[PDB]
Amino acid sequence: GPMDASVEEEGVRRALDFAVGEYNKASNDMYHSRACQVVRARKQIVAGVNYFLDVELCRTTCTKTQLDNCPFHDQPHLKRKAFCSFQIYAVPWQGTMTLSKSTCQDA
CATH number of the domain enclosing 37: 3.10.450.10
Q: What are φ and ψ of residue 100, in 5° steps? A: -65, -40
First to last CA, the chain: 27
Number of domains in the chain: 1
Pairing of strands 48-63, 3-5: unpaired
Q: Which strands form 48-63's sheet, in the order they lie side by side?
A: 3-5, 31-46, 48-63, 82-91, 96-106
Name the resolution in angstroms: 1.7
> Do 24 and 33 touch, CB atoms closer than 8 A?
yes
Expt. technique: X-ray
| Residue 64 CB coordination number (10 Å) | 13
* Structural domain boundaries enclosing 96: 1-107
Provide the residue type at 76 as one letter. Answer: P
**Using CA atoms, how far apart are residues 37 and 107, in angstroms rounded to an integer?**
12
